Design a protein around this nucleic acid. Sequence first.
RNA 1: GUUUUCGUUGUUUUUU
Lengths: 47, 49, 263, 66, 45, 49, 113
Amino acid sequence: DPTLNKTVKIRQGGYKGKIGIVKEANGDRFRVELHNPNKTIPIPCSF
Amino acid sequence: EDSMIMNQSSIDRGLFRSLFFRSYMDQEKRFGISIVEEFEKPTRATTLR
Amino acid sequence: EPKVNIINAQDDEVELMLSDVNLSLANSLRRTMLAEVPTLAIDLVEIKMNTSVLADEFISHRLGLIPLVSEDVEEMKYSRDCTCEDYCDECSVVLELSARHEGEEGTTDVYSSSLIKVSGPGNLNVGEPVRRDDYDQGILLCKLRNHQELNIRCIAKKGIAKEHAKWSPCSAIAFEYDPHNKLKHTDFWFEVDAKKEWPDSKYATWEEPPKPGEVFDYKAKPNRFYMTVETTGSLKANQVFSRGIKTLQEKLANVLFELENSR
Amino acid sequence: MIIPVRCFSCGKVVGDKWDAYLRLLEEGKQEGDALDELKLKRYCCRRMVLTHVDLIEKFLRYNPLE
Amino acid sequence: GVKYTCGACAHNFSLNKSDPVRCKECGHRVIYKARTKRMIQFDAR
Amino acid sequence: LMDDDPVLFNRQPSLHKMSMMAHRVKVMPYSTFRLNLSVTSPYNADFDG
Amino acid sequence: MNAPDRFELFILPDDVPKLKITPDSRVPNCIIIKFEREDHTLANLLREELALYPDVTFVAYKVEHPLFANFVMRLQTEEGTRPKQALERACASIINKLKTLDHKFNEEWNIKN
RNA sequence: GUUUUCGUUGUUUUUU
Ligand SMILES: [Mg+2]
Ligand SMILES: [Zn+2]
Ligand SMILES: [Zn+2]
Ligand SMILES: [Zn+2]
């Protein structure tokens, strides 16, 4: 999947307005790392 | 039993909040006049493991 | 039944006589104002570049600690509620600070006044940096030296002290009642005597000192309480009082709405 | 190293008063007296500034790389 | 290519992994890299 | 590892059999092991580190 | 690194209701209320108002554990009154008392200035 | 396309 390793930010949800990067995209579900928190969270592709 | 109960908000106000710093080191190594190590972004096709 | 008699009121503080009410209710309302008051503080701190001597996160934290004029925080939505992609002006505010020290000698003391309301859900009187006085630069923010520039762009969002203490609108909120221990709700430690060893409450005047031979009334209950409603400046002690009352009221209304809906 | 923004205990904003507090110090006004001037009654507040140590200048003393 | 800077004279210069690493302007033998070009955030909490 | 699951429990030095036990899992957030305050006696320990 | 989120202290998840009922079979006309996203502020306030009611046999709440934004209460209104009705009664009573104090404080702030 | 790896031995320090 070449749509990874790119800057990604959230449009809606509980962490709306946070920058992040994509690491693992097994399928139809995207896991993203965040900058201010030292944590990585899942989220559907569409958000 | 020496278990401490603290003001949450004071920590929200950063009381006793401390820094950390970690310094690393690296350097290119020489295996010989003609053989050294190279600082690069390795591509998979060239380097392995 | 509930009663109010302001002893001393101010922009920052409201000191009043709340009586004819319950101890539990007074504590709950105090909690409501202290923690259950949504407010606006610097949340998303973003550096275009920096040259100062302090950790970027340290500056960001100190920025969040800044009270902001939050009169219309009642009006602007939470960022989470808004459905717009990314933020919009109706769900967040844009400020900016960008300070530089020029000159090989000296030190440019960056001040909160340097923070400026770039945007915000106008005409909401929000996002304005709070200051003791207009001539008051505000809280000292940073010190920039020779060849030390600072450019930053932050985004604040409406939130509650429960979420983070930066949203605490009230700097402090005291409490008491029955300063004479008429209800005997406390046992007074002493070596010779509590009376001659203990000071007297500032509100002691409002209640007579119990008579020597007076027999204890186990029907005595907490009725008259004493209060001062401090605000960190983001809002008025009267506005804080009213808004905390309204928040408690909305919570109760929602609770009863759930009572009827779940049934 | 700098003045705290607020009072840890209660959260009273304190950073602004520092410069004013320092000015009060300049004339040797007694610690307690100056504290009183600043309308800083709660020793929860008084404590930091009474024993607050400021050392950012020592960082400014260092020649910045740029 | 990449932007660097000296520690003594305070000047930015770019090498291309070919020039031996020495200050291009004051000969100081210690260089450094500069900030990145991506934007930074902070929760300020 | 699901809650209430039996698991071992071992502290040092293990002078006697009561020095160790097995417990039912109760997962919570935060990164410390939480113990009913009575268990300490055989463990002869406090929260001093 | 295992610490829970702060913003969830007040956010109710969709799948769970803000409140949860459960009748207490062990004694007559006694229910159990499971709470979410609430603390002493509402708990004690509702509890005291209800305890002032005469038509209540039993009522008591407790927080199972501070780390979780959820507690429980065991109410028992006497035979005539089912617990839920006395609960909404206390809700309305506190609503009106708070509104009374609100208008009173409006008046007192207005006059004081 | 599945698959897939970092060293030792010492030292000294503290950790109860
Ligand atoms: Mg020990
Ligand atoms: Zn929006
Ligand atoms: Zn204080
Ligand atoms: Zn140079």
